[PDB]
Each structure stands twice: as structure tokens, then as C-alpha cells.
Design a protein around this ligand. Structure first.
Ligand SMILES: [Ca+2]
Length: 122
């Protein structure tokens, strides 16, 4: 499910300013993390990342590949592949509170400058 820039802008409302991260920074971070695809699945080494935010199953959510996950978000990873981003966002908040925005390697590298390009109107 490939969302558009403004659909992401609209759906990530509850993250606005959280942890001091602006909405524009989030639209930018999710693109360079999953390309706006809520069904994105990437697995490198002993880890598989899920959804729009690419939440790993190493410590955030539990899945099949790793039953022994810390599962800090207390949720099955498959819940990060549907169209409802509510539970994804709740988990993102736990990630921000704990490891911070740097979980998303893309934020520092490309989403800390030039943010106006990522805004929407109306
Ligand atoms: Ca979800």
C-alpha cells in the first residue's frame, strides 16, 4: 500500500512535535525508510523490519522468525503491515521515548535540513 506524501502528512498528525520531531521531519523520515509503503518488509541478517516505519522484530514486536523477542511494543509485528497506523504510531512513540529519533538512520542523514519541501496544503 503505497501512500502519497500528503496522505502521510495527514495520517501522522498524532506525531506532530512529539519528542520535538516536526511533522515535516516525519514525512521525510518515513519516505527514506519505506518509501511510504505500509507493507514494506526488509530483512537483513537476523532481523526483519516492518511497515511504514520499519519497526524491527529484534526488540519491538514479536513475530514468527523471532519468538524470543523482547517485544517492547507488546504487539505482533504483522499489525504493522495493515492500513491502520494507530498501533504503529503508538509503537513509534515508545521507540522515540527510549532510543530516540536516531533509530531512523535517515533522520540525521537527510531529514534534519530542508524540511519545507515535505509540507502539504489545504
Ligand atoms: Ca497497523
Amino acid at each position: 500500500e503505497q501512500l502519497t506524501k500528503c496522505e502521510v502528512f495527514r495520517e501522522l498528525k498524532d506525531l506532530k512535535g512529539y519528542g520535538g520531531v516536526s511533522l515535516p521531519e516525519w514525512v521525510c523520515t518515513t519516505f527514506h525508510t519505506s518509501g511510504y509503503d505500509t507493507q514494506a518488509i526488509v530483512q537483513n541478517n537476523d532481523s526483519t523490519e516492518y511497515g511504514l516505519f520499519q519497526i524491527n522484530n529484534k526488540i519491538w514486536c514479536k513475530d514468527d522468525q523471532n519468538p524470543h523477542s523482547s517485544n517492547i511494543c507488546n504487539i505482533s509485528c504483522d499489525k504493522f503491515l495493515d492500513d491502520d497506523l494507530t498501533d504503529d504510531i503508538m509503537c513509534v512513540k515508545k521507540i522515540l521515548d527510549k532510543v530516540g529519533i536516531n533509530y531512523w538512520l535517515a533522520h540525521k542523514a537527510l531529514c534534519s535540513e530542508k524540511l519545507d519541501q515535505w509540507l502539504c496544503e489545504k
